[PDB]
Amino acid sequence: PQPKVLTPCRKDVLVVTPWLAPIVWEGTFNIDILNEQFRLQNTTIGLTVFAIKKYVAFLKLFLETAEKHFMVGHRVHYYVFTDQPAAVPRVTLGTGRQLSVLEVGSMRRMEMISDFCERRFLSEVDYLVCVDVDMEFRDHVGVEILTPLFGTLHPSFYGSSREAFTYERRPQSQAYIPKDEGDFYYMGAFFGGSVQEVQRLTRACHQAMMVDQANGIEAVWHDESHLNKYLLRHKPTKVLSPEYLWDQQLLGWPAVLRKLRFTAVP
């Protein structure tokens, strides 16, 4: 369908940031075009997930639903970090898709990605997508999200003013953002980018959390607080709308959300 310069497809929402990054909503992208572009590069996406203690119970649905909706037709590498490798369910995967189980014994999430697993990610995947396991895919999540660096609009704050944002406000913490600065409030639970840029962000977030710790302070939303400082200083190249991180039980299904793609499990 021919793009019409004088008819916008979405008039109800901001679809581009003030630094000219796309904000990704249904109706802003032709998935066929995008797929071609990423297919021509034989793109591999890595999807990383922590499943610790009782959160391994979430893996089966997370995985099942990822096969249905996530990067379908592209190469995909799931990396599952767990304390119970035996509890990881065997889910049958589509062609070009694989899973690795990564055993571990707060801020170690950021540590694991940036330090321990650095060389591995660099050789195996082109992009990294970092999400929470207590979720399911309900609709398309695809290469429209891919870019050097993205975050996602936190769903209880997209419609709000910045003084309301739950940024860190104590200057003694590295994640400090003043009352009059800040573009959006990004969710700590869905971010990514190229491997290079994802390692930069998680290296920086670790380094900053080490400092707060050495000083007996802890940011009010922990890794999400440092994420928000990062993304203020280094602006994401795409921002995903709340279509990509929703909780239907707490917020319903507003008309402004034409699809709910990735949601909390009740």
Which CATH number characterizes residue 168's domain? 3.90.550.10
Catalytic residue positions, numbered: 224
Resolution value in angstroms:
2.0
Tokens describing residue 208: 């900053």
Q: Is 142 exposed, middle or buried (0-12, 13-18, 19+ CB in 10 A)?
A: buried
Residue whose tokens read 């891919």: 146
CB count within 10 Å of CB 79 equals: 23
**Measured between alpha carbons, how far apart are the two ends of the chain, in Å?**
38
Tokens describing residue 3: 């793009």
Strand positions, DSSP E, 87-158 = 97-103, 127-131, 135-137, 149-152
32 is in an annotated binding site: no
50 is in an annotated binding site: yes
Method: X-ray
Domain with 67 in it: 1-266
- Domain total of the chain: 1
57 is in an annotated binding site: no
Strand positions, DSSP E, 7-148 = 23-24, 44-51, 75-82, 97-103, 127-131, 135-137
Q: CB under 8 Å, gap of 24 or more: what pairs does 72-75 form?
A: 72/142, 73/35, 73/39, 74/35, 74/38, 74/39, 74/43, 74/44, 74/45, 74/142, 74/143, 75/42, 75/43, 75/44, 75/45
